[PDB]
Amino acid sequence: TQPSVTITENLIFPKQNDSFIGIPVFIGYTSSPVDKTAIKLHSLADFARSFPESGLMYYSVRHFFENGGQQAYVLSLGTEQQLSDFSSLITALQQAWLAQTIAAENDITLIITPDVIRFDQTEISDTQRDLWLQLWQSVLNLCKSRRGIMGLLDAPDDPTLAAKCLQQFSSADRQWGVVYWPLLKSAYQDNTQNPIVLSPTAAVAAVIQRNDNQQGVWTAPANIALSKVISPVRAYIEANALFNPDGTSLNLVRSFPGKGIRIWGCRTLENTHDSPWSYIQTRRLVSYIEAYMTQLGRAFVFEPNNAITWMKFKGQAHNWLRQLWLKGGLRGTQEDQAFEVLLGVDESMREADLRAGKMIIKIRLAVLIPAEFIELNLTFDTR
């Protein structure tokens, strides 16, 4: 027992101070019961500390961490013995304490439900279509608990049913929903040595979190290869009805010869042609801009409402926005084209607003458009 060098199988869990723009939360039934709080994980070791290494939730979290993820949250709805059917899961996602827990946590930015894959999908009845429509609305209602959160959604395995859901979905929360298809055959094996089928949303969340630090929040997270994925469940030739340039559409997950399995879409559920939130990276960039202005704006609460205060905000907001513009985060060849900030007693407010205690700031932005299609026209030089 003297001082010496020894080999151990124990693990250490030092505190981590890193921060990321996009942090997902895994909401579903776990191996063991826990309280109503959200557990923060820094690696797969933290998950084993709280839950046993088994079940669908374990492999979804493992798939997240092996795809480049760094920080995640787990919210347990109960033990795995309470799984009954699809409608019960929808009811569980509609509980009241979920919104309060999500809202109280400011780190959470994405929502993932790994337990949608468990249930059977052998009937293409209209009852199933209504059930899927309810699930999307339930997740989107959780995103509305706080500005900036979006939910990564699953789709019915049968392409005909999925196309039916897209056409008949109606909601005012489309801009906060992103759907991926189909399911993925992971590289992990269960007791009977069969591959484990996982939802693509677990790997997409790691890609989105990783892409923010590498390329930027204004860069589309599509066209990126996944890891620990053997093959998608269904081939790309079955998804010709799931992309509508003038309607609701899915983001396909596809394999290429020599390129692996890659994400092949960047659209949200926003079906309006002229809507500005048709792309995920556009919705995330504006929320990233909103988050900064919220933080900057908080410094001026309970401050005197005079011209000096407005200049302090306008100078700093103009300063930060130009730095983002010079990094390629906004579209425009001239500074006045990229953005504009208005804040004054007559530019954006009235004397009535000052008496009410308000301070109104007007911000305009110009965003970039992803390159989805490339057409080549070849002509002969007339010389």
Residue 372 Cβ, how far from a second copy at the closest point, in Å?
Answer: 4
| Min CB(169)–other proteins separation in Å | 30
Q: What are phi and psi of 221, to 5 degrees?
A: -80, 15
**Cα–Cα distance for residue pair 38/34, rounded to 1 Å:** 10
d(CA 276, CA 283): 8
What's the CA gap between 202 and 199, in Å, rounded? 6
Q: Does 4 bind a second copy (CB under 8 A)?
A: yes
Selection from a second copy, other proteins, none that 303 binds (CB < 5 to 8 A by kind) is: none
Contact yes or no for 252/362 (Cβ under 8 A)? no
* Region binding a second copy by CB under 8 A among candidate stretches 4-12, 88-96, 138-146, 157-165: 4-12
Name which of a second copy, other proteins, none residue 229 binds, using a CB cut-off of 5 to 8 Å depending on partner kind.
other proteins
- DSSP letter string, 234-274: S-GGG-TTS--TTS---EEEEEETTTEEEEE--B-S---TT
Shortest CB 2 distance to a second copy, Å: 9
Residue pair 97/78 in contact (Cβ under 8 Å)? The answer is: no
- Residue 66 lies near a second copy (rule: CB under 8 A): yes
Q: Tell me if 232 sits within 8 A of 255, measured CB to CB.
A: yes
Q: Is 381 a binder of a second copy (CB under 8 A)?
A: no
Note whether 274 binds a second copy by CB under 8 A: no
- Closer by beta carbon to other proteins, 81 or else 295: 295
Q: Could you tell me the two tokens for 256? A: 């290429």
Binding of residue 14 to a second copy (CB under 8 A): no
Name the pairing type of β-strands 362-365 and 229-232: unpaired
Question: Before 182, cis peptide (omega within 30)?
Answer: yes
Per partner kind, with CB cut-offs from 5 to 8 A, the member of a second copy, other proteins, none near residue 66 is: a second copy
Q: Which residues bind other proteins (CB under 8 A)?
A: 3-8, 10-12, 14, 185, 187, 195, 229-232, 255-258, 260-261, 325-328, 330-333, 338, 368-381, 383
Cβ-based nearer residue to a second copy, 141 or 227: 227
* Both tokens assigned to 342: 């208005």
Binding flag, residue 375, a second copy (CB under 8 A): yes
The binder of 256, among other proteins, a second copy, none, by C-beta within 5 to 8 A per type, is other proteins
Distance of CA 382 to the CA centre of its chain: 51
Spatial distance between the Cα atoms of 179 and 176, rounded to a whole number of angstroms: 10
Site string for a second copy, 355-374 (x = CB under 8 A): -----------------xxx
Residues that bind a second copy (CB under 8 A): 3-11, 66, 372-378, 382-383
